[PDB]
Tab-separated table of C-alpha atoms and ligand atoms in Angstrom:
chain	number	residue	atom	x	y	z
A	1	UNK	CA	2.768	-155.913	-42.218
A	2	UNK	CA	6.296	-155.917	-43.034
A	3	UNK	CA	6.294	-158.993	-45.636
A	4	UNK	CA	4.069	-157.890	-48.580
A	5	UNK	CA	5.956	-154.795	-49.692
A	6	UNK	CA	6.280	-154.364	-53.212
A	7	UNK	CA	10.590	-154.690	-54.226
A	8	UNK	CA	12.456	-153.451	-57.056
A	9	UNK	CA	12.511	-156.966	-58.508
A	10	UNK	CA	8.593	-157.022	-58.825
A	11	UNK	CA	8.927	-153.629	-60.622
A	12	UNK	CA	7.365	-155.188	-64.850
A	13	UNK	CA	7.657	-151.466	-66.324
A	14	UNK	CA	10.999	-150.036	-65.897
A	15	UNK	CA	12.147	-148.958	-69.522
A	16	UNK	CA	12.094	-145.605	-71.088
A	17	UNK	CA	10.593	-144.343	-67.326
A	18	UNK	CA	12.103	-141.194	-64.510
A	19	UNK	CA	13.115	-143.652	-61.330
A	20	UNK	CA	13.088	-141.583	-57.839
A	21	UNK	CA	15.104	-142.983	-56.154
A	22	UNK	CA	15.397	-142.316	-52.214
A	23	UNK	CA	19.174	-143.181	-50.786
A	24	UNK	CA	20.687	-143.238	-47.762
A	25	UNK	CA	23.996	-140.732	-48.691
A	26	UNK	CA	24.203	-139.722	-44.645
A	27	UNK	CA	28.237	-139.718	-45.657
A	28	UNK	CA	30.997	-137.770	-43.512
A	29	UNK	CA	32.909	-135.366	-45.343
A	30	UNK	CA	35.971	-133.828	-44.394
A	31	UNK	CA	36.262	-130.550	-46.503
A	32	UNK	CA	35.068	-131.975	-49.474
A	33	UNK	CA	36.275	-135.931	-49.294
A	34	UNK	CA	34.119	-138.131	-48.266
A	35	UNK	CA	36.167	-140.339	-45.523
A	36	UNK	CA	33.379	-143.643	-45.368
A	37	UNK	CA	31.929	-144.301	-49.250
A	38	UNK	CA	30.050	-147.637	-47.616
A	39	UNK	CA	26.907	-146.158	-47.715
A	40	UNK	CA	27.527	-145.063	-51.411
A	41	UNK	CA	28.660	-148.431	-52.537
A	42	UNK	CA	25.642	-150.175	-50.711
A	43	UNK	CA	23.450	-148.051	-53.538
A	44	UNK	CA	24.861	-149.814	-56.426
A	45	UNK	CA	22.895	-152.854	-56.877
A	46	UNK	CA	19.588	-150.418	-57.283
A	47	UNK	CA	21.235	-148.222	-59.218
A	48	UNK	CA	22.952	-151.497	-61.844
A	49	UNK	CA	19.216	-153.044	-61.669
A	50	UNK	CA	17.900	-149.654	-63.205
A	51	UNK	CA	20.336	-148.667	-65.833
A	52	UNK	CA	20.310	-152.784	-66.913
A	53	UNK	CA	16.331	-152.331	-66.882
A	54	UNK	CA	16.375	-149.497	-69.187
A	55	UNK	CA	15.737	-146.535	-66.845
A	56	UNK	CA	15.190	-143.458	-69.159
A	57	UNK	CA	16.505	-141.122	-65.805
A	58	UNK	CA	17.583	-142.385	-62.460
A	59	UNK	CA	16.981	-139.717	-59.962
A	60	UNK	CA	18.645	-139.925	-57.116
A	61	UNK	CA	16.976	-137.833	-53.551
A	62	UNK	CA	19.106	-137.687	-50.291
A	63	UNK	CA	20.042	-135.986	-47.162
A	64	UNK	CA	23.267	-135.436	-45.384
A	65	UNK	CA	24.222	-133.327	-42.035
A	66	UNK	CA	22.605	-130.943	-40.414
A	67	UNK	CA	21.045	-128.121	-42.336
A	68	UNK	CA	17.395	-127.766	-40.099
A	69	UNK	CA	15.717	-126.909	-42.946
A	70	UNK	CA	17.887	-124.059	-44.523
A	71	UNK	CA	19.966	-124.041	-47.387
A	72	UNK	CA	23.428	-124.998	-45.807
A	73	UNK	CA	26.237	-125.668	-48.269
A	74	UNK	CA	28.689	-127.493	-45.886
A	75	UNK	CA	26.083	-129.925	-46.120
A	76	UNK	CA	25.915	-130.215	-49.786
A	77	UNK	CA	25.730	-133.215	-51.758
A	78	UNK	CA	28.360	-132.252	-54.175
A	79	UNK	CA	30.810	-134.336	-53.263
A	80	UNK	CA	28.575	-137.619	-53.122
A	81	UNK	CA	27.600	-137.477	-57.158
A	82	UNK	CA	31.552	-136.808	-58.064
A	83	UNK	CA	32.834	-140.142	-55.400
A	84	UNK	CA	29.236	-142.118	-56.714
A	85	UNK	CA	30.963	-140.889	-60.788
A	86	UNK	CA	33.742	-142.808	-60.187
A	87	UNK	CA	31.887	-146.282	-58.809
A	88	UNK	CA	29.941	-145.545	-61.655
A	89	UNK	CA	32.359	-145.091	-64.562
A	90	UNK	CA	30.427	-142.551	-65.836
A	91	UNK	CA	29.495	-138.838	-65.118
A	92	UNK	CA	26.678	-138.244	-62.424
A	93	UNK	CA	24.889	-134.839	-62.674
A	94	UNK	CA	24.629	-132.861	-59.923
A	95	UNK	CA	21.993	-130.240	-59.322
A	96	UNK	CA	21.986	-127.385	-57.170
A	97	UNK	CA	18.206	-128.076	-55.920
A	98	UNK	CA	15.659	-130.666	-55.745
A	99	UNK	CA	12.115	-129.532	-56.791
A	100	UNK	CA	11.040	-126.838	-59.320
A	101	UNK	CA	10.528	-126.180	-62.915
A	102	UNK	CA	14.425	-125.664	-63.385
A	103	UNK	CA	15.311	-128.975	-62.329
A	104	UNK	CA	12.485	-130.649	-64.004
A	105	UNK	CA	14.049	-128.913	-67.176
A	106	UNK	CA	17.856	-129.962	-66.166
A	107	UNK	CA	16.268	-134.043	-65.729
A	108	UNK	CA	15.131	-133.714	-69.095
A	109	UNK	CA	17.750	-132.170	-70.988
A	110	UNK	CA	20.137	-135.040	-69.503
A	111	UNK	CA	21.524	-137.919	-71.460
A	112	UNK	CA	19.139	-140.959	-71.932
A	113	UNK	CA	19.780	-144.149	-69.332
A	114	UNK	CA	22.233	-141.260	-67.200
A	115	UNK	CA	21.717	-141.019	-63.066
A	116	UNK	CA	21.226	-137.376	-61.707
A	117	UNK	CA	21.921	-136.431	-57.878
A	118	UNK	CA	19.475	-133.449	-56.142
A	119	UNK	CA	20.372	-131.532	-54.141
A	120	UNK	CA	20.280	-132.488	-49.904
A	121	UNK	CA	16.390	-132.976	-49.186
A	122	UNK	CA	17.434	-131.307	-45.816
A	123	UNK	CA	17.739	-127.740	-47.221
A	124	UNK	CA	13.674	-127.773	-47.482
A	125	UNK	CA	11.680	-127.247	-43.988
A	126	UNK	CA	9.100	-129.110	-45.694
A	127	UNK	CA	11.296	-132.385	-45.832
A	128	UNK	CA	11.285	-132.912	-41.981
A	129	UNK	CA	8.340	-130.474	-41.541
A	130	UNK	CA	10.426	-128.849	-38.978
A	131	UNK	CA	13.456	-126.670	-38.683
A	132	UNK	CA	15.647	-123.714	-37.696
A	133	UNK	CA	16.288	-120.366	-39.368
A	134	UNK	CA	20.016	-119.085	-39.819
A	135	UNK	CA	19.296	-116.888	-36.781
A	136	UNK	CA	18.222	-120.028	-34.634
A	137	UNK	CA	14.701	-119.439	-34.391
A	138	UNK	CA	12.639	-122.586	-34.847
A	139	UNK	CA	10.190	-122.819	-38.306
A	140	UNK	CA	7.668	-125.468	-39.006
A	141	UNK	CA	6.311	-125.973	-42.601
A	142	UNK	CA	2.186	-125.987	-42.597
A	143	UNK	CA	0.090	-128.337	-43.782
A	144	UNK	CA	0.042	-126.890	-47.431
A	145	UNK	CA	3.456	-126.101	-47.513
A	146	UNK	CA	4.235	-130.474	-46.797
A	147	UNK	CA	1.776	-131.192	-49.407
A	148	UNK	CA	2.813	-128.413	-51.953
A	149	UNK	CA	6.593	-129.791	-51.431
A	150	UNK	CA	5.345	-133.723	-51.375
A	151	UNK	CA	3.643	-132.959	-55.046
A	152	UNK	CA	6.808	-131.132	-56.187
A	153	UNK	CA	9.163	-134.276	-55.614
A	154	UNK	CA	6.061	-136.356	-57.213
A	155	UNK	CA	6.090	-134.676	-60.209
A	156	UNK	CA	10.364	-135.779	-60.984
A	157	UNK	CA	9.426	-138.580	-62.027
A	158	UNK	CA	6.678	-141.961	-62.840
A	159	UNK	CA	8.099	-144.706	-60.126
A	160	UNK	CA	9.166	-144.243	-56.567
A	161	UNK	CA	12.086	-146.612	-55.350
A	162	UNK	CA	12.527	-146.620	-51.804
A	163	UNK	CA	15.993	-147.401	-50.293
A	164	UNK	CA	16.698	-145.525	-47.584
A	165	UNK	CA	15.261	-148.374	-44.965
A	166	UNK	CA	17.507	-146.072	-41.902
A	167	UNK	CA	14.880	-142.757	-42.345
A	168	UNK	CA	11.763	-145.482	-42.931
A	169	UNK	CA	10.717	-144.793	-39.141
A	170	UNK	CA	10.313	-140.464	-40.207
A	171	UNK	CA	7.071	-138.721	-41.590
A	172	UNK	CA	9.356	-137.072	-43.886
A	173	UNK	CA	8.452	-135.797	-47.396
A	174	UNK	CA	10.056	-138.129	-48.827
A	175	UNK	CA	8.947	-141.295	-47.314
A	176	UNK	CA	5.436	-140.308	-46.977
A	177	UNK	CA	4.613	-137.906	-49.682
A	178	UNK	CA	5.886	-139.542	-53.030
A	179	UNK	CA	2.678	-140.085	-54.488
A	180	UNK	CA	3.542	-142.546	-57.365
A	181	UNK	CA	1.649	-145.693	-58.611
A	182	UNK	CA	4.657	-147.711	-58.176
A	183	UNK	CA	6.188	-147.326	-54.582
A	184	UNK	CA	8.536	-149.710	-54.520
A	185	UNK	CA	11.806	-150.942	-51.931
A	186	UNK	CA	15.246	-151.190	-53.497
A	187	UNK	CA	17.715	-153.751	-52.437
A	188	UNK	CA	18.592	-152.720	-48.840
A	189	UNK	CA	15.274	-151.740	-48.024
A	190	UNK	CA	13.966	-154.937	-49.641
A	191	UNK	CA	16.453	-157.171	-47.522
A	192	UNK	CA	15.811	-155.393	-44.262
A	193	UNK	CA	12.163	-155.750	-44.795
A	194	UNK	CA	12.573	-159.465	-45.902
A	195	UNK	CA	14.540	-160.485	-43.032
A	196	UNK	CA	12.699	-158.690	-40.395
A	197	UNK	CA	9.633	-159.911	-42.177
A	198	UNK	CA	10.945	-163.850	-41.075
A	199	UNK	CA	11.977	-163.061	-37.950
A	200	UNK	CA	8.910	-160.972	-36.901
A	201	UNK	CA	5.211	-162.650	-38.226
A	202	UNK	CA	5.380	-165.888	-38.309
A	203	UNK	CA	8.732	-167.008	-37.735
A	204	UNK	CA	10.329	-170.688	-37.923
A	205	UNK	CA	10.076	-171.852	-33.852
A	206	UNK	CA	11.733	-171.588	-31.682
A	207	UNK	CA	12.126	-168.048	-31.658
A	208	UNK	CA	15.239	-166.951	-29.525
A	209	UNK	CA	16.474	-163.055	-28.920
A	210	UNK	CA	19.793	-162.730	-27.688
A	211	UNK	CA	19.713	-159.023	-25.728
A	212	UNK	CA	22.510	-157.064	-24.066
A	213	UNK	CA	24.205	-154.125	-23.376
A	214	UNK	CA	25.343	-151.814	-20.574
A	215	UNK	CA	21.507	-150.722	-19.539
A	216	UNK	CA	18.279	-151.897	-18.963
A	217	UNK	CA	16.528	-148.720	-18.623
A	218	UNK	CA	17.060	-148.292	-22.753
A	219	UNK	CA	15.997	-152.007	-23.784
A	220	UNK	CA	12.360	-152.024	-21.948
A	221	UNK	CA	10.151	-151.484	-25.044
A	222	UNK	CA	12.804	-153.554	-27.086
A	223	UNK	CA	12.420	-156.445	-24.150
A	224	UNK	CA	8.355	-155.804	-23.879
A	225	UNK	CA	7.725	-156.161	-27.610
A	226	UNK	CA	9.933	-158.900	-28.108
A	227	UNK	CA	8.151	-160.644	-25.122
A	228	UNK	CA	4.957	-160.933	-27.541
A	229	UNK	CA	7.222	-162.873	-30.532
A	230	UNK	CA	9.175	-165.000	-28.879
A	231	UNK	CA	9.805	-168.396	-27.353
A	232	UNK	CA	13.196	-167.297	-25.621
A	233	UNK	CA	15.385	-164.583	-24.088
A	234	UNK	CA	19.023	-164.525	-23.397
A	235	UNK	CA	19.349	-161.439	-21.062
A	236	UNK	CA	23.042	-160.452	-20.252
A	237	UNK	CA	25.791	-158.306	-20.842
A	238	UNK	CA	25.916	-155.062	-18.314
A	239	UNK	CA	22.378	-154.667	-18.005
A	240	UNK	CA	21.783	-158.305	-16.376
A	241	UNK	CA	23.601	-157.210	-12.899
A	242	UNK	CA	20.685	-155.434	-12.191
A	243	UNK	CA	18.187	-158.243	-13.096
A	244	UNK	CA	20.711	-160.581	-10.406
A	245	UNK	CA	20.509	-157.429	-8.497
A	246	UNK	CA	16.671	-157.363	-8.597
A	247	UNK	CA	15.745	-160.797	-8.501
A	248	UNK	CA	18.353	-162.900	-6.860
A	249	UNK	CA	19.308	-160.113	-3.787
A	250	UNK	CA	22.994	-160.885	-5.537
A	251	UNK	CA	25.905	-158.797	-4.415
A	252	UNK	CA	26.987	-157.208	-7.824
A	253	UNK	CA	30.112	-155.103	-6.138
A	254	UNK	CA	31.133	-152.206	-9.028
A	255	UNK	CA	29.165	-154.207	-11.534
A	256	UNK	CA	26.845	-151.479	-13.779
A	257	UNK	CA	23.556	-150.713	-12.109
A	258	UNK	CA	20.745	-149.171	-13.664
A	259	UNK	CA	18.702	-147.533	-11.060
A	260	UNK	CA	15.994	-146.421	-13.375
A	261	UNK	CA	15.836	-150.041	-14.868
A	262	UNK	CA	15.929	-151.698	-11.944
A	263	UNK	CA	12.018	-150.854	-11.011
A	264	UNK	CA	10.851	-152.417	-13.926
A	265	UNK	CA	12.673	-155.737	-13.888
A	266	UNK	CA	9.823	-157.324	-12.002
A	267	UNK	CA	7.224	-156.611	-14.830
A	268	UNK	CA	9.712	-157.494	-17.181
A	269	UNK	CA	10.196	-160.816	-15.814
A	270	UNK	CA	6.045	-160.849	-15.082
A	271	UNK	CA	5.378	-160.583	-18.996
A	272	UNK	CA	7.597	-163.262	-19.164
A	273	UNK	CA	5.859	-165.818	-17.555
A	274	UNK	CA	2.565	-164.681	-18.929
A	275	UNK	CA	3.902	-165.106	-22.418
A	276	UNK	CA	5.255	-168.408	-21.583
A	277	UNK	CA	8.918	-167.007	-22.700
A	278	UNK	CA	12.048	-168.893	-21.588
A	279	UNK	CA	14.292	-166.515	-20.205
A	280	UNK	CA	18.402	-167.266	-19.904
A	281	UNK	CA	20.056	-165.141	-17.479
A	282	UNK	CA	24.009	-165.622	-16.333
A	283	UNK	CA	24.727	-167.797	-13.527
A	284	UNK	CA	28.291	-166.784	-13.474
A	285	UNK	CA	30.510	-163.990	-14.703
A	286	UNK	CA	34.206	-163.318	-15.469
A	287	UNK	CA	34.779	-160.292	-12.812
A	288	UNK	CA	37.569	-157.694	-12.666
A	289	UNK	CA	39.029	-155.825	-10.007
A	290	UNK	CA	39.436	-152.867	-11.837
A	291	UNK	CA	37.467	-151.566	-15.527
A	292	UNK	CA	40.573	-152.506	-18.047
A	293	UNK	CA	41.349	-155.478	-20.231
A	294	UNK	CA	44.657	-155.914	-17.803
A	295	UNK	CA	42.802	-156.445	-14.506
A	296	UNK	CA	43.071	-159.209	-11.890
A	297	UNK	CA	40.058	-161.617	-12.993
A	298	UNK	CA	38.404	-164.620	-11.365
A	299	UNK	CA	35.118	-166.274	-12.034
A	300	UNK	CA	32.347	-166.281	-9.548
A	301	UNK	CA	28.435	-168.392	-9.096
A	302	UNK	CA	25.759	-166.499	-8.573
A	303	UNK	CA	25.634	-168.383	-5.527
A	304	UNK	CA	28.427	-166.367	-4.309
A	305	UNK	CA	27.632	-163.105	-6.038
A	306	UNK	CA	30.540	-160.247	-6.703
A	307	UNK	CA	32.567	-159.055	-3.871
A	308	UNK	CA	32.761	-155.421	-2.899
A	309	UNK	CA	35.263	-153.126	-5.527
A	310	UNK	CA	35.040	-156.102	-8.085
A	311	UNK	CA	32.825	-156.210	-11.187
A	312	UNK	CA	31.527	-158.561	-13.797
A	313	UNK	CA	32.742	-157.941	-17.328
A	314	UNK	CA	31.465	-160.827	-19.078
A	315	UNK	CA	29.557	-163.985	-18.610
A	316	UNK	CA	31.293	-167.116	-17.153
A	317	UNK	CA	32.087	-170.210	-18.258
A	318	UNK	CA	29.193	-171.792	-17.096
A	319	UNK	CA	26.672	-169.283	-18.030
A	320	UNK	CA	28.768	-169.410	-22.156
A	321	UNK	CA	27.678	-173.420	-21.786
A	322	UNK	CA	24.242	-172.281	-21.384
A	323	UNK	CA	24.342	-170.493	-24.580
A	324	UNK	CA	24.694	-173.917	-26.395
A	325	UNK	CA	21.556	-175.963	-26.537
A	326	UNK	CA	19.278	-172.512	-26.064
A	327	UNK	CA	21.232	-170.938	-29.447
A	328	UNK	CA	21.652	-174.219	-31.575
A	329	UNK	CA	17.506	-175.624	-30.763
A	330	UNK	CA	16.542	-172.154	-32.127
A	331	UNK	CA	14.935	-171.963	-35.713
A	332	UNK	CA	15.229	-168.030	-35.798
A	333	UNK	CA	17.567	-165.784	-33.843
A	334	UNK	CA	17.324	-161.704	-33.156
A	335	UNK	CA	20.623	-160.549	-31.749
A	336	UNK	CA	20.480	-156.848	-30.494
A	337	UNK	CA	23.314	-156.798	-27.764
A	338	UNK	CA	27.227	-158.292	-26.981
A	339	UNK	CA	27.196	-160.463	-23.530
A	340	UNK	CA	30.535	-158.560	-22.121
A	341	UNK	CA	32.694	-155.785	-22.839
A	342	UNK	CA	34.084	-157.084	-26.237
A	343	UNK	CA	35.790	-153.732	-26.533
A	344	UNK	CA	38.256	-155.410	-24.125
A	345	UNK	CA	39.858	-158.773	-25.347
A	346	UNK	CA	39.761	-160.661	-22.316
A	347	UNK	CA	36.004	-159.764	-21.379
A	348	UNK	CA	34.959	-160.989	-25.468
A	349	UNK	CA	35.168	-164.754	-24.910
A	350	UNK	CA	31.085	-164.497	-24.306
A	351	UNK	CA	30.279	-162.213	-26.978
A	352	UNK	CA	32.955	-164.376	-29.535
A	353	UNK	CA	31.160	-167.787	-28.610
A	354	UNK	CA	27.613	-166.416	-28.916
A	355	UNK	CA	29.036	-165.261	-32.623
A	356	UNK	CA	30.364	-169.140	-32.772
A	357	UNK	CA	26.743	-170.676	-31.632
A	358	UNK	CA	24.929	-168.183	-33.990
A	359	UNK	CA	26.998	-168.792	-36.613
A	360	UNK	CA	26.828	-172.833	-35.979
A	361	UNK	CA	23.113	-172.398	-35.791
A	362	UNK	CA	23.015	-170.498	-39.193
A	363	UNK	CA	24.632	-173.268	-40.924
A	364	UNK	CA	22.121	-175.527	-40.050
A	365	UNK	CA	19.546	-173.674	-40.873
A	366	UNK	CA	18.260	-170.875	-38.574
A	367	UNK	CA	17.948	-167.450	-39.978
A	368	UNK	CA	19.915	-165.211	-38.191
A	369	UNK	CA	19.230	-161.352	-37.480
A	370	UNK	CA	21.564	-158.891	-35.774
A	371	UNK	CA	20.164	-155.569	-35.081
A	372	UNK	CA	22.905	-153.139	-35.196
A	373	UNK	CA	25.173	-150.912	-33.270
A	374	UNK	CA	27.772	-152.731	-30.932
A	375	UNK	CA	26.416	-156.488	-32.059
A	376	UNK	CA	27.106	-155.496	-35.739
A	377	UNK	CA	30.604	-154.088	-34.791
A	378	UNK	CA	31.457	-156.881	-32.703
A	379	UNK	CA	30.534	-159.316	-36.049
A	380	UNK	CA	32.670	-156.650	-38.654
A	381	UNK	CA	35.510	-157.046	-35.945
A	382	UNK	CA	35.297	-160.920	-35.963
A	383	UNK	CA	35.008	-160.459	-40.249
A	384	UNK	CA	31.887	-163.184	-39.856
A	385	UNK	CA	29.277	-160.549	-41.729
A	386	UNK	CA	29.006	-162.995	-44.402
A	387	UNK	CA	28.000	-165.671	-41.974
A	388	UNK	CA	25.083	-164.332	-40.122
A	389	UNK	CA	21.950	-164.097	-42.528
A	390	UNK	CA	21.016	-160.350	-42.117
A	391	UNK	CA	23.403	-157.744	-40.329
A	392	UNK	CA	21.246	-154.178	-39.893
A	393	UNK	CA	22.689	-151.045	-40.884
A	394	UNK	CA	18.650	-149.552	-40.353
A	395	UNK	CA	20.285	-147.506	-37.143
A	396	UNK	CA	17.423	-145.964	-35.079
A	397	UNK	CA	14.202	-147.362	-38.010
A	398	UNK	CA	15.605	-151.296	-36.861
A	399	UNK	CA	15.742	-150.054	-33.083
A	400	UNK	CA	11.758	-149.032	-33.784
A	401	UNK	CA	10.715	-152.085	-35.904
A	402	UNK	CA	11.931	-154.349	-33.350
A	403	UNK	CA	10.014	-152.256	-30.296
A	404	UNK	CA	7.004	-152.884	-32.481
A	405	UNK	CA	6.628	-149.013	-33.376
A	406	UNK	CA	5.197	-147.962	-36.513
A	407	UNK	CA	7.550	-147.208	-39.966
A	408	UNK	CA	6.011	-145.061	-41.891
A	409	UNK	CA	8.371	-144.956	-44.838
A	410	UNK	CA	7.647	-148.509	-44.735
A	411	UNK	CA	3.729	-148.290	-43.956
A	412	UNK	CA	3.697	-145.777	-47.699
A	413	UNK	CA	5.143	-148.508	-49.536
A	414	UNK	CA	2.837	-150.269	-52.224
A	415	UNK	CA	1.649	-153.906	-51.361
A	416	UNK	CA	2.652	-157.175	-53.579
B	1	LIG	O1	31.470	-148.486	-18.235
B	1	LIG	C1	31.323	-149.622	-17.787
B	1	LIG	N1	30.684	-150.577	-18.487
B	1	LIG	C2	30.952	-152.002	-18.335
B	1	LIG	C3	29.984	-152.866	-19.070
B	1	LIG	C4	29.342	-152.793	-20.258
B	1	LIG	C5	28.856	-154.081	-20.547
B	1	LIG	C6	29.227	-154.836	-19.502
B	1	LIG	N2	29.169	-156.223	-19.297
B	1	LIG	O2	29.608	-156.671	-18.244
B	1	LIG	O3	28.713	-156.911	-20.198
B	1	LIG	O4	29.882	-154.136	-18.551
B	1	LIG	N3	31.032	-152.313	-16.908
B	1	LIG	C7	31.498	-151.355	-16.056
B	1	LIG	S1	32.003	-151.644	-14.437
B	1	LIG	C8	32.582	-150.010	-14.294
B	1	LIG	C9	32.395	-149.280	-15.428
B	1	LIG	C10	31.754	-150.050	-16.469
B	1	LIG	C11	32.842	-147.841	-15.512
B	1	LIG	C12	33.805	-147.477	-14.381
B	1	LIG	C13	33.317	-148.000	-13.041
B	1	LIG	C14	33.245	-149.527	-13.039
């Protein structure tokens, strides 16, 4: 279950306690600035809520880079506490390691109500349970050595706050191995987990996903698991030439095709039916006669297909009418995928009025839920964030949720 997850704001006994708190601090940083603080800033609503609630320490645990289990200071955290100081308006301490009696002694020692950064999680085998020496030789952590480093990170503090929903699909020590009464999610993790909740056990009906992309050959288990949820499917974008391909014998001329892919279209479209899912695809496309936002376009049918050395780029006018009555009758939407190459202005108009119908849909009342990568870019781009009820920035842990794969980072969590 994804629904009954105990949150921050269920947290009674807060005051006078040591919060561990897991963050997402994955930052790049160019020799010592840190060039996106997004990440950093999404942290502050967990980090007010404790501090207003009395926290006697707020203990902050992270990760950033690549260190493979070895104590790698380009990959410090330094930087993070001194950028997360100034947010703050007050001095975060930094310290040079994570676990041990020194730091338990340095948590103490510090300033009642005051938030305290460890040292990258990363620089311990244990945290991953796998890594690589400075010599390159691979080194796993036993057993005893996960659980000896799990207790160790335990022992910081009295409750566990979990927001750092994008490493929730990892065995890692720090999403399995806190072994606190109170396991709680803070406010990203809680909304993710919320939202995916509604959209995922018992949703309002109809339940539409809107899929796309360049490939089908990446989407099956996304496709197949959403198959057992919901009501609808919008397939498009790149990866439906090769369903037209498949299905229809229609000429797709330069159009993307995903050999791999195409073998499983058939089942795909198989599950379908025996789930009783609707399933959209285009019936005509805005095509190019070469890949760039200044080609010679034209709209074609699927009647007549794509001519040899020409290529679909987007979905056509008549296929973007389609869009209307199967986007506004829907109750609760899962967007994973833009219906063109937005990248390009002239091949957007499909992806920009699926935003529109989404959007319209929204205001009425469907909950909304856009999965990430190129989908989420495409709505920054447009600046309509605020208008689409929860945008993902879970990364690969959304991917697995929504392909039905277990979280466990979320599965560790304690229950309402
Ligand atoms: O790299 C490419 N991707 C695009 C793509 C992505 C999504 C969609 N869509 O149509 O929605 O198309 N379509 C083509 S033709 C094409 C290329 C691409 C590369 C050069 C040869 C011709």
């Amino acid at each position: 279950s994804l629904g009954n997850k105990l949150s921050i704001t269920d947290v009674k006994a807060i005051q006078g306690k040591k919060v561990l708190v897991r963050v997402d601090f994955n930052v790049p940083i160019e020799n010592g600035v840190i060039k996106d603080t997004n990440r950093i800033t999404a942290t502050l609503p967990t980090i007010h809520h404790l501090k207003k609630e009395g926290a006697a320490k707020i203990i902050l645990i992270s990760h950033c880079g690549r260190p493979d289990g070895t104590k790698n200071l380009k990959y410090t955290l330094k930087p993070v506490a001194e950028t997360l100081g100034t947010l703050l308006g007050e001095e975060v301490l930094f310290l040079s390691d994570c676990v041990g009696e020194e730091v338990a002694a340095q948590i103490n020692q510090a300033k009642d109500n005051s938030v305290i950064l460890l040292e990258n999680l990363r620089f311990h085998v244990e945290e991953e349970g796998k890594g690589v020496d400075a010599a390159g030789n691979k080194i796993k952590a036993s057993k005893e050595d996960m659980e000896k480093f799990q207790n160790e990170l335990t022992k910081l503090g009295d409750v566990f706050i979990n927001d750092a929903f994008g490493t929730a699909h990892r065995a890692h020590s720090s999403m399995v191995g806190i072994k606190m009464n109170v396991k709680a999610s803070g406010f990203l993790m809680k909304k993710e987990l919320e939202y995916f909740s509604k959209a995922l056990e018992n949703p309002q009906r109809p339940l539409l996903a809107i899929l796309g992309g360049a490939k089908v050959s990446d989407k099956i288990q996304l496709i197949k698991n959403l198959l057992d949820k919901v009501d609808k499917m919008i397939i498009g974008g790149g990866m439906a030439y090769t369903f037209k391909y498949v299905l229809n014998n229609m000429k797709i001329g330069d159009s993307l095709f995903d050999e791999a892919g195409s073998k499983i279209v058939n089942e795909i479209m198989e599950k379908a039916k025996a789930k009783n899912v609707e399933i959209y695809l285009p019936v005509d496309f805005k095509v190019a006669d070469k890949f760039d936002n200044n080609a010679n376009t034209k709209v074609v049918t699927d009647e007549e297909g794509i001519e040899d050395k020409w290529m679909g780029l987007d979905a056509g006018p008549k296929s973007i009418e389609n869009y209307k009555d199967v986007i506004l009758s829907s109750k609760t939407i899962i967007w994973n995928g833009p219906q063109g190459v937005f990248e390009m202005p002239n091949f957007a108009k499909g992806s920009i009025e699926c935003l529109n119908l989404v959007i319209e849909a929204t205001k009425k009342g469907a909950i909304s839920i856009v999965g990430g990568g190129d989908t989420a870019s495409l709505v920054e781009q447009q600046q309509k964030k605020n208008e689409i009820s929860h945008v993902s920035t879970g990364g690969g842990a959304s991917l697995e949720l929504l392909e039905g794969k277990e979280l466990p980072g979320v599965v560790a969590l304690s229950s309402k």
